[PDB]
Design a protein around this ligand. Structure first.
Ligand SMILES: CCc1cnccc1C(=O)Nc1cc(C)c2c(c1)CCC(=O)N2
Ligand SMILES: CCc1cnccc1C(=O)Nc1cc(C)c2c(c1)CCC(=O)N2
Lengths: 493, 493
């Protein structure tokens, strides 16, 4: 198996604008921490509005008609994405080490999940660049009508700390595929892998200004992007709460186009005719993967009454043996939460569960004295009115509910402001299709959980988001459609 | 030729919810006027928040799983749209008369343009309902993945007074095609044809609550729709200013999906090789059609300087002969503006043009008769810094500018926060394609103007809107995409 890079240097700590490494305009640098120890790893140049402004100017010039990026064959945009994939593959262990050190992700999981996703995302979209087609249309009257799908322009992108590098790839790959330029802001907690990608972008040979990477905080760098009158499109992944602010800012400023990938409280429905041991393991991973810090978390597990007691027992056994420890250690299943703020929020919600009469089966406490580790926690006898049944915990807390009928569980699963994902476990084709069709969710899994692929679109119903990422449909957010209608002397079919 | 329905009575004046005619909850009514005479036509029930709430509940129930509308074959949704087209065709003269009386549109133009568009829109979308396809996707891993394209749910729609019935059709046709339910709010100036459509919707046999029609004011009924937490999607056509408020309100409330069709200051570029008889007439219609009350108005005509003087001469001649009068008179080319507020806005902008040194070639005043009639007005020697060159007038005011080079006119055409449409008149293939490709506009015409078709998408770049209506792409705003990923024991290609 691969090992964490020894003596990892953090070489790239500056703002990346126009393929040049720059100090912040203010001169400030901000600290970056290791969530396993609480100790400072390094300092990073702290971008604010002045820096955003320079980045937008660079991105706008790079998007100008006649520029290298605009004149480039679509196929050559694709080649650049493929080159970037090659470089990520070359530096896979370094990047996984960085994600582990900075993000708290177990190194092997960062290597085999996150980095695999990054590489596959770039390789997938590399293939789309010269296959984005408009249409020719048999309109009424003596006209020739066609559509031209063009890049929108300068795209602002704001990404979270739970999947720093993977979300970076999810954002820039479709944007670049379509020929846009980018100003991207990684989360304050987790800038490092994004900055390393700046070095790879330069090495790959992207024209200056096509990707600009602006590390810094939300009210400064993030807000400056959201309200910028020179940015045509914003893509945001994060909390539903902040998503509302993004949409508001878009409306108030320049009506920039918006897509949002937001939170969830996703249902996972287990029928008695499911493969039980498989369902237990899948539901366990479905909530505990990535320290519970997944918008996809299956945080409402509905179990059919006849298998409820056994499902709970097996789930508790599994949670009790789940190995929490140092991200670099190959035995580790679960690393720390990202920071103290998240740690405290999780503990408060656990206490709410106890207070409101959910059965605490195991866990419920922090682990150790350093970093932000929390015991794998299981609640049973959860009911729909409980805070823990409604609020996104974003930590290692499993909630198990009971149901009797398919009609009941469909209603209860759908009774949410959220609708990111859902799942159903059953060997009955009729139940599987009925439930999956009825779910108000952007992705529904049948007899699996957390099965994501570069080829398949992903996004929220309701307040879990607007628009889709990944697959062909991810590209729809990153082009502007132009209809051209030409008068012709006479039309024939 | 057809004649306006004699002694037209307004049968339908009430709120339409759940296929029933209802009084306002408050009991309040509001007056509706004839813009040609200033006289009151009738009173209509005034919808407010309480009425919106009732309509949303009806629309939600009609959208419930297992409802008649949800269970219906897609092909049968299509048949209902085709039936509605049949009924509009049957009542074409009545509806055109109503659009003329209420909206100030010359009767023959309402009959042959607006009503034609209504019928064609319904017949076009009738054909789409059972041809909306998801995909099956060759994802990595042992999975079967497909997408379901589902209706979003309850769609709030707000439409303007400049094309009351046509915009009603533009909105409900794609929404219903996709299987949504609708709460639609016509402009307070022009509710009448929308209410008549309620009668036809019931007659066609749409299930109760599928379309609900809520006449009332913007700050009351309109705002209630925009902020409603039980509405999944909003579509708004109107000013950019109000568009910004819609997006903001969506962000603040429930992150409902937003599409906007907003203002323009669209360029119409005439090269010296253009046929003048044709180009002058097309440019004339391009700005004067529908009392100048078109988002598509070609309100910046750029003429190559060698033909500029002649183009102006011809344009002035045409404007001076343009017949302004009673909408019911078959000789009338131009009816009144919609109301006194718009009338005053137009005159103020004309005054600004004179003050800033534009050359008033003809017109420039109200006609001084009953109603809200304004002389066809032509300005030449318009420059880019003038208020009339920047601000949407929405009245019978033509603006003619000169240019010398292609590079120049592309830059000047695109130097705008708007980008709804554009046109270029030239027989030179290279110039035509270079200019059309370079325009930052959602529709570009070559050697024509105002050529719209049910088959071709339409919408704004920049602050002229977000999203597209009409054609296949119009449907994309009215479906939610669900990915379903099924674990399978083994995959083969
Ligand atoms: C590119 C697909 C892929 C391929 N190979 C490896 C990984 C991926 C990939 O993206 N996986 C992935 C896994 C999970 C659990 C989540 C997300 C992504 C998005 C955020 C979230 O909440 N959950
Ligand atoms: C359905 C296409 C169609 C077909 N036959 C007849 C009419 C139509 C149709 O819609 N025409 C149309 C004409 C103009 C000038 C405008 C608009 C629509 C949209 C608003 C605007 O500003 N301008």
């Amino acid at each position: 198996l691969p090992s964490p890079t020894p003596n990892l240097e953090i070489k790239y700590t500056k703002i990346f604008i126009n393929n040049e490494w720059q100090n912040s305009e203010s001169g400030r640098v901000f600290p970056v921490y290791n969530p396993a120890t609480g100790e400072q790893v390094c300092e990073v140049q702290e971008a604010d509005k002045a820096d955003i402004d320079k980045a937008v100017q660079a991105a706008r010039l790079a998007f100008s008609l006649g520029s290298v990026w605009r004149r480039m064959d679509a196929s050559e945009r694709g080649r650049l994405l493929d080159k970037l994939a090659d470089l990520v593959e070359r530096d896979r262990a370094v990047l996984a080490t960085m994600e582990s050190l900075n993000g708290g992700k177990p190194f092997l999981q960062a290597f085999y999940v996150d980095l695999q996703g990054v590489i596959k995302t770039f390789r997938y979209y590399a293939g789309w660049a010269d296959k984005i087609h408009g249409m020719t249309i048999p309109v009424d009257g003596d006209y020739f009508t066609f559509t031209r799908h063009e890049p929108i322009g300068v795209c602002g992108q704001i990404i979270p700390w739970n999947f720093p590098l993977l979300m970076f790839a999810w954002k820039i790959a479709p944007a670049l595929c379509c020929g846009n330029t980018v100003v991207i802001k990684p989360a304050e907690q987790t800038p490092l892998s994004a900055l390393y990608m700046g070095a790879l972008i330069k090495e790959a040979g992207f024209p200056p200004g096509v990707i600009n990477i602006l590390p810094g905080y939300g009210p400064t760098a993030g807000a400056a992007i959201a309200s910028h009158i020179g940015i045509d499109k914003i893509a945001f992944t994060g909390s539903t709460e902040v998503g509302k602010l993004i949409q508001e800012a878009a409306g108030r400023s320049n009506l920039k186009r918006v897509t949002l990938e937001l939170g969830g409280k996703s249902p996972n429905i287990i029928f008695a005719d499911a493969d039980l041991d498989y369902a237990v393991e899948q539901a366990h991973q479905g909530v505990f993967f990535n320290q519970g810090q997944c918008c996809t978390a299956g945080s409402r597990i509905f179990v059919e009454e006849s298998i409820y007691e056994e499902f709970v027992r097996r789930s508790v056994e599994r949670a009790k043996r789940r190995v929490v420890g140092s991200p670099f250690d190959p035995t580790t299943e679960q690393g720390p939460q990202i920071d103290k703020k998240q740690y405290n929020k999780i503990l408060e919600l656990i206490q709410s569960g106890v207070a409101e009469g959910a059965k605490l089966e195991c866990g419920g406490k922090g682990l150790g004295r350093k970093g932000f580790f929390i015991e794998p926690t299981v609640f049973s006898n959860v009911t729909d009115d409980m805070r823990i049944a409604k609020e996104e915990i974003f930590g290692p807390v499993q909630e198990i509910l009971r149901f009797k009928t398919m009609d009941e569980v469909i209603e209860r699963a759908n009774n949410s402001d959220f609708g990111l994902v859902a799942a159903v476990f059953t060997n009955d084709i009729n139940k599987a299709l009925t439930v999956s069709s009825a779910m108000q969710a952007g992705t529904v899994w049948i007899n699996c959980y957390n099965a994501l692929n570069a080829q398949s679109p992903f996004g929220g119903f309701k307040m879990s988001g607007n628009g889709r990422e990944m697959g062909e449909f991810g590209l729809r957010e990153y082009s502007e459609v132009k209809t051209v209608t030409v008068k012709i002397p006479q039309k024939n079919s």
